[PDB]
């Protein structure tokens, strides 16, 4: 898919790391601050485990930019780098699916 204005970042988080509100907030800001180097970030979605179940999209990080070009630059600037020693893998998301907030 793509290019589009929504970026999906994979291989960065363990569900365990998303249970504590303090640690969850730290990860979101970490993502925002780095993605903001490339564009204005309109939204960030990081699905969290609920009732001890990995909900659709848990494990993934979604970031929406104001333009396709800004999303493209962020994909180039972030893909293949390390986040908590893990190689970052990326794909474009369908803004429609993101507009529905349907993750998988």
């Amino acid at each position: 898919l793509g290019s589009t204005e929504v970026l999906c970042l994979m291989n960065m988080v363990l569900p365990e790391e998303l249970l504590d509100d303090e640690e969850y907030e730290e990860i979101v800001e970490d993502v925002r601050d780095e993605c903001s180097k490339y564009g204005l970030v309109k939204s960030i979605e990081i699905p969290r485990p609920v009732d001890g179940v990995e909900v659709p999209g848990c494990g993934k990080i979604f970031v929406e930019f104001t333009s396709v070009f800004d999303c493209q630059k962020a994909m180039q600037g972030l893909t293949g780098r390390k986040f908590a020693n893990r190689v970052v893998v990326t794909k474009y998301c369908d803004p429609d699916s993101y507009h529905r907030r349907d993750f998988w």
Binding site: I27, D30, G80, K82
Partner: peptide, 12 residues
């Protein structure tokens, strides 16, 4: 105290 490495993508 970011979890991001400093290394540019072009250098990976």
């Amino acid at each position: 105290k970011s979890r991001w490495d400093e290394t540019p993508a072009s250098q990976m």
